[PDB]
């Protein structure tokens, strides 16, 4: 028995009308979500966004939804994201390398779908999956 569930990683970034005291030109938000009609909270323990050096306390953790980070900045960067599962057996997380990229002349609305595949999950984990929109194959 194999269950597949869907994740959407994405971000929006708009160019500020006025930069901040520190010369931050953009506001952005990055997120992890289920597709429409999918609360991934049921099988997602927490999400960890490993921001760049320059943000204070850059290991950002969301234990409940929304799994998001809102900040201001001046540049884009590569960002590891780790989704940890409400699973007591392996696998207990998955990592994506996310590219938080900015539009210097306007906005960015970016979306990227990732399909997770869990093999022979435990009985109570297979719920969390199916409760979150999972599909059996």
């Amino acid at each position: 028995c194999t269950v597949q569930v869907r994740l959407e990683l994405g971000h929006r970034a708009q160019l500020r009308k006025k930069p901040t005291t520190e010369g931050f030109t953009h506001d952005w938000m990055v997120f992890v979500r289920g597709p429409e009609q999918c609360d991934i909270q049921h099988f997602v323990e927490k999400v960890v966004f490993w921001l760049h050096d320059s943000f204070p306390k850059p290991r950002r953790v969301c234990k409940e939804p929304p799994y998001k980070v809102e900040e201001s900045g001046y540049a884009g960067f590569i960002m590891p994201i780790e989704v940890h599962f409400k699973n007591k057996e392996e696998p207990r997380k998955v990592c994506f390398t996310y590219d938080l990229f900015l539009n210097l002349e306007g906005k960015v609305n970016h979306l990227r779908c990732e399909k997770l595949t869990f093999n022979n999950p435990t009985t109570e984990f297979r719920y969390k999956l199916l409760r979150a929109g999972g599909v059996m194959v």
Binding site: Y74, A75, F77
Partner: peptide
Amino acid sequence: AARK
């Protein structure tokens, strides 16, 4: 700076 764009991209750090």
